[model samples]
Target chain A: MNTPEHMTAVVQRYVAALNAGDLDGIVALFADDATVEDAVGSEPRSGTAAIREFYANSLKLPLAVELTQEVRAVANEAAFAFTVSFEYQGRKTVVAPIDHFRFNGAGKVVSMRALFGEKNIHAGA
Target chain B: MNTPEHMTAVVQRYVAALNAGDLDGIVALFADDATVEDEPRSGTAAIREFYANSLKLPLAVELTQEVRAVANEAAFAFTVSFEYQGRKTVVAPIDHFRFNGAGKVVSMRALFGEKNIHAG
Candidate 1:
């Protein structure tokens, strides 16, 4: 895939796999030394083993993301903004945020940084 | 200008003009109808009037930024990672930001996004 198509595919597959609870599918997109920071006050997850452990232990609710913008490619990076909805402790939460992805030479994700807000909880609910 | 120098100069001149209270100097860099999102805000400073007013009342503190990474530009957008400090703050005060071509800032600044924490 070229730059734009490659970026779109990566993002689409990411959200789709998450919504479908396809753990292995999501992990497959990452590079060997990939890293992820999902939320605040949580230790970062790195590598395939750590990522899987973090997801299995921390993901207690179903999540879905409604993308507001398509993936925009910049060099070897792709980014987009979206609103995420999930259930936690019987309370529904929605967060509007941006996710940035940096890919390796082989087009696999090397790192992901998620930016979100807390005030949206009232509006999202 | 080369890539590294150009990027560094842009950011340096920008922050310097602000810190030195050089409104006109800062305005010179922006294109027509240039935009600025000082802090969780927006406005079309179309020309000189709006921008001048915005700076008049606001006594801005010195903001020092330490850039972590500068990705090679694709098309015309330049993406950057940086940490900024001010009087009011948040735990994750860094920014992973992108600037489009036209030399104009088209995206909104999302404060308190993610931490400037880079393991690499």
Candidate 2:
């Protein structure tokens, strides 16, 4: 498969893993030195170990992650919109973040940056 | 122009107008009933008003990377760099747009958060 198609499939896997709360499955799609600057413009976590820790903390609650728009892939990079919903401290919040991913030659995701603001967070179930 | 091409062009026009701070030029690309929920609002008038207010900040919005077009929609990552109260602020947002059959943008919503907005 081509790079864009492969990247879309990779993104689908990431979404599925998140929704399934499959930590290992999620990490398996990343390159060894992959970096994640979730909510971009923040400190990024690097490598598999740091990525593992980030996902571990994020999955503390049963999160529902689903793609809200078609995956946009070009030049080995893809950006997708998705919603992450969970109940925290009895408040159900749903956040819509557009995440960008860059794939390495080996088809593994090397970098990811999530873009979203407080305004994207909707309260209630 | 094809749907994808048209959609991509609209995005290009958008960034051009945004960089020029051309409120009218930007608003002209939307459909009559187009809805823009920068954070998800509804209605064309609301979208136009949103752009009008946003352009008040003496902003320099640029497409940081190539625009991605596929499946009748397009998404692009951009930065809005501006200064306020002597604090330089830069916001990175990914805006997704859906095009109508007529090639006008039917919906547009920018995705960016407080974390994505930085102050230097």
Candidate 3:
């Protein structure tokens, strides 16, 4: 059910939703009991309620998001590298992260993890 | 124990070993009980043999972007270029490495598919 085409489309929609600040669009991509770890090593937000809250808080600041490379999809998993650029208090920060999504049989993202570190964060002018 | 500097160095050494076809060097980056998800290789001996078989055909591997390392995990996007039977191909895969407390890779998974493969 989680075909590569479907998975890649979902990834594209995710990036689109983030850029458009469509909180609902972002949350609708996950399963009801899915978990999201925006950064590895952090606590994963479980369930749609917590996932919804996470995105709601994230979308607070307008973010310029774009895919830095093509999405790699294999089996029921997909990973993509992208950059999130946002300006806070007149200071611009761009974070490049490689996000992974594990899909369930129904094609819904069950687990999501965004991997990045301090080296990936760059000052943006 | 999995410091960012240590994790980053292991990844660099991994790429260097791959490019150099140093199978032993590549295997040294993993823990004794490490597991690789590419073909589901488990344990040091199995993991070592997996890379040993892979190095049979010389591969040109290079990181496409900066390695993303955090916590005890790291992921990097890279391309493995190789030729077989006079057919040259390039595959771009994003590999995730989970580090042990000793800063050695305990689990490794490479994510890619036909879509990421190309004829060269």
**Across residues B1-120, which tens digit of lDDT does each residue of candidate 2 receive?**
235567668888898898899988998898888888654656677877899899988888787655656545677778889988889998777788877777888888776544466784
Candidates, ranked, TM-score: 3, 2, 1
Per-residue lDDT tens digits for candidate 1, residues A17-110, read 8788788888888888999877432467899998777666535567787765445654566766666777766677776656778888888898
Best by DockQ: 3
Which stretches of candidate 2 lie above 4 Å from their native place? B1-120
TM-score of model 1's chain A = 0.87
User: What TM-score would chain B of candidate 1 score versus the native chain B?
Assistant: 0.47
Q: Return the candidate ranking by DockQ, descending.
A: 3, 1, 2
Worst 10 residues of 3 chain B by lDDT: B36-45
Fnat across every predicted model, in order:
0.00, 0.00, 0.91
lDDT of 1 at A22: 81
Measured against the true two-chain complex, the DockQ scores of the candidates, in the order shown, are 0.04, 0.04, 0.89
TM-score of 1: 0.52
Which candidate would rank higher by lDDT, 2 or 3? 3
Native RMSD of candidate 2 (Å): 16.9
C-alpha lDDT of residue B28 in model 3: 90
Q: What are the per-residue Cα lDDT tens digits for candidate 1 across B24-65?
A: 776665555444442233334543554575455333333332
lDDT of 2 by residue, A1-125 (tens): 23667877898999999989999998999999999886545779999999999989889889988886567665667777788999878788987777888888888999997755444578854
**Fraction of the native A-B contacts that model 3 recovers:** 0.91
| After superposition, candidate 1 runs with Cα above 4 Å error | A40-42, B1-120
Ranking by lDDT: 3, 2, 1
